[PDB]
Design an enzyme around this catalytic site. Sequence first.
Site, PDB file in Angstrom:
ATOM      1  N   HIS A  75      25.868  15.934  25.425  1.00 34.95           N
ATOM      2  CA  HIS A  75      26.374  15.594  24.094  1.00 34.95           C
ATOM      3  C   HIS A  75      27.750  16.224  23.923  1.00 34.95           C
ATOM      4  O   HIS A  75      28.227  16.926  24.824  1.00 34.95           O
ATOM      5  CB  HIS A  75      25.391  16.023  22.979  1.00 34.95           C
ATOM      6  N   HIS A  77      29.182  18.573  21.945  1.00 34.87           N
ATOM      7  CA  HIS A  77      29.464  19.989  21.663  1.00 34.87           C
ATOM      8  C   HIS A  77      29.976  20.749  22.880  1.00 34.87           C
ATOM      9  O   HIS A  77      29.602  20.458  24.012  1.00 34.87           O
ATOM     10  CB  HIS A  77      28.208  20.671  21.119  1.00 34.87           C
ATOM     11  N   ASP A  79      29.227  23.468  24.233  1.00 33.41           N
ATOM     12  CA  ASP A  79      28.278  24.102  25.155  1.00 33.41           C
ATOM     13  C   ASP A  79      27.779  23.116  26.217  1.00 33.41           C
ATOM     14  O   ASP A  79      27.073  23.511  27.153  1.00 33.41           O
ATOM     15  CB  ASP A  79      27.084  24.778  24.412  1.00 33.41           C
ATOM     16  N   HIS A 137      19.630  16.158  17.317  1.00 33.28           N
ATOM     17  CA  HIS A 137      20.558  17.280  17.256  1.00 33.28           C
ATOM     18  C   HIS A 137      21.996  16.827  16.994  1.00 33.28           C
ATOM     19  O   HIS A 137      22.713  17.457  16.220  1.00 33.28           O
ATOM     20  CB  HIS A 137      20.489  18.087  18.546  1.00 33.28           C
ATOM     21  N   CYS A 156      20.231  20.055  23.959  1.00 27.82           N
ATOM     22  CA  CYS A 156      20.083  20.678  22.660  1.00 27.82           C
ATOM     23  C   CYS A 156      19.187  19.851  21.740  1.00 27.82           C
ATOM     24  O   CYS A 156      18.934  20.242  20.602  1.00 27.82           O
ATOM     25  CB  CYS A 156      21.454  20.906  22.041  1.00 27.82           C
ATOM     26  N   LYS A 159      14.013  21.408  20.883  1.00 23.43           N
ATOM     27  CA  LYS A 159      14.066  22.552  19.967  1.00 23.43           C
ATOM     28  C   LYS A 159      12.650  22.952  19.544  1.00 23.43           C
ATOM     29  O   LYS A 159      12.214  22.627  18.438  1.00 23.43           O
ATOM     30  CB  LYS A 159      14.914  22.200  18.735  1.00 23.43           C
ATOM     31  N   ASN A 165      21.498  24.644  15.039  1.00 21.98           N
ATOM     32  CA  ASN A 165      22.644  24.179  14.277  1.00 21.98           C
ATOM     33  C   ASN A 165      22.478  22.736  13.817  1.00 21.98           C
ATOM     34  O   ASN A 165      22.377  21.839  14.647  1.00 21.98           O
ATOM     35  CB  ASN A 165      23.912  24.318  15.110  1.00 21.98           C
ATOM     36  N   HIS A 195      18.671  25.934  24.762  1.00 25.28           N
ATOM     37  CA  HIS A 195      18.775  27.246  24.129  1.00 25.28           C
ATOM     38  C   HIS A 195      17.502  28.077  24.098  1.00 25.28           C
ATOM     39  O   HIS A 195      17.490  29.180  23.548  1.00 25.28           O
ATOM     40  CB  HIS A 195      19.299  27.069  22.710  1.00 25.28           C
TER      41      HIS A 195
END
Length: 219
Positions: A75, A77, A79, A137, A156, A159, A165, A195
Amino acid sequence: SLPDLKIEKLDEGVYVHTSFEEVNGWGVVPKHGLVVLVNAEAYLIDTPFTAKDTEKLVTWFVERGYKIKGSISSHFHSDSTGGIEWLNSRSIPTYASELTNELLKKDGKVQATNSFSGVNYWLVKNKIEVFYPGPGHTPDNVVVWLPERKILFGGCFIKPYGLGNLGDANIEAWPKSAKLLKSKYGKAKLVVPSHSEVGDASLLKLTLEQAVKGLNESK
Ligand SMILES: [Zn+2]
Ligand SMILES: [Zn+2]
């Protein structure tokens, strides 16, 4: 000081890389991605947060005899995409979904050199598959499936203990997407979130429960 880049073997031809960044309102954040080996070629599944750690990750595999054939980012982001600019500078092919590239471009960030559009895509035929379960996400999040190992990199999107976030999240759609993901990959041997720690297929259920819980809370 932030912890160092970590590289750990997860399965045959599959490694987990962990990088760390201080993120406002979140603290020091671990980020898991994968390196997947197909013969003497390596594929990065997500880049680390930074060019520095991306270079360390690449040198580690090259010095052990694997050619980096490409990367894919799950994605937009940083990270997942932080190392794309560095990889591009080294003529290593970078991949992202059409929507991921669009969001990067919109944010005035470097884009992957290759893009794919549609729900399923083979990064490497019969070895590394990409699947879009729908918004969660982020609007663009995709997962990566390794059919030979029954390993799912959930990024991400996965979860299992809390949604994290929600800045770019689509809480309305996440339960539906997570249901679809669960149906498709119920037989995963391992599920690798961005994460939190690697688990089994139960992480798909837990993600779904958290998504439902998150949506309920917002009303
Ligand atoms: Zn993200
Ligand atoms: Zn993330």
